[PDB]
Design a protein around this ligand. Structure first.
Ligand SMILES: C/N=C(/NC)NCCC[C@H](N)C(=O)O
Ligand SMILES: O=C(O)CCC(=O)C(=O)O
Ligand SMILES: [Zn+2]
Length: 236
């Protein structure tokens, strides 16, 4: 496929018309790049503000066979165990609303203006922290709302497949896992999943300051390339 387009602070109507309404992915630059989080958030500072709080942590590379488990620990324990000291397994602080838990971290972000183009209420926008070492993998999956994924620390390799291509992505049959792909994007078994080979996609390397707009129900797979902190806004 091709690289995801990058636009420097598009006007709202131009984002509405070329991207939101047709549902095409884009990176928005010059938008979140000066938010306080971009210069303020570090291991020192995350420990200082959030260190003693309780967070859920996903342990294991990815979630299919339950090797993957979910646990709870303090942010300090997560940093020390899964990031700093030669971790024994991949832990990921994933899909957690950490800014409703620590309001003082919410002062470091904002809700992007483009969300007001939606039909939903600003109070109901779901804000999720994603924080973990180099190498976390979110398997190919789709989400029920629009998403702004704001990169803060580190880089993420991302791949996007359209809803129109779902027939080549082999979703799990169980309605629980309905929206997750059985395919390992970066090493697909093409004996089992042959149609995955021909399906087109976009990909990118998302970097700090940059916002990736993921259209509703667009499939995405995400691998952190460095120690990484992203913040997702689910809106509608
Ligand atoms: C690696 N782990 C992850 N989540 C637990 N990755 C991305 C979130 C996928 C989830 N189905 C969603 O609703 O976005
Ligand atoms: O693991 C990641 O960073 C991707 C998060 C994600 O899937 C989402 O923003 O909905
Ligand atoms: Zn997602």
């Amino acid at each position: 496929g091709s690289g995801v387009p990058r636009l420097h602070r598009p006007s709202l109507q131009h984002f509405r018309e070329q991207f939101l309404v047709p549902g095409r992915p884009v990176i928005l630059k010059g938008v979140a790049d000066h938010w306080p989080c971009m210069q303020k958030w570090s291991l020192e500072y995350i420990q200082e503000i959030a260190g003693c709080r309780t967070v859920p942590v996903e342990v294991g590379s990815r979630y299919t066979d339950e090797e993957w488990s979910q646990t709870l620990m303090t942010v300090n324990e997560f940093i020390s165990k899964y990031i700093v000291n030669e971790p024994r397994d991949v832990g990921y602080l994933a899909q957690h609303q950490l800014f409703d838990q620590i309001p003082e971290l919410k002062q470091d972000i904002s809700i992007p203006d483009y969300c007001s183009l939606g039909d939903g209420e600003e109070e109901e926008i779901t804000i999720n922290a994603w924080f973990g070492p180099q190498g976390t993998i979110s398997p190919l999956h789709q989400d029920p709302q629009q998403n702004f994924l704001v990169q803060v620390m580190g880089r993420k390799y991302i791949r996007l497949y359209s809803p129109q291509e779902s027939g080549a992505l082999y979703p799990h049959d169980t309605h629980l896992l309905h929206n997750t792909s059985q395919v390992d994007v970066e090493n697909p078994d093409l004996e089992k999943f042959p149609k995955f080979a021909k399906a087109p996609f976009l990909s990118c390397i998302l970097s700090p300051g940059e916002i990736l707009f993921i259209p509703v129900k667009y499939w995405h797979y995400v691998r952190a390339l460095d120690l990484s902190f992203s913040v997702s806004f689910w809106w509608s």
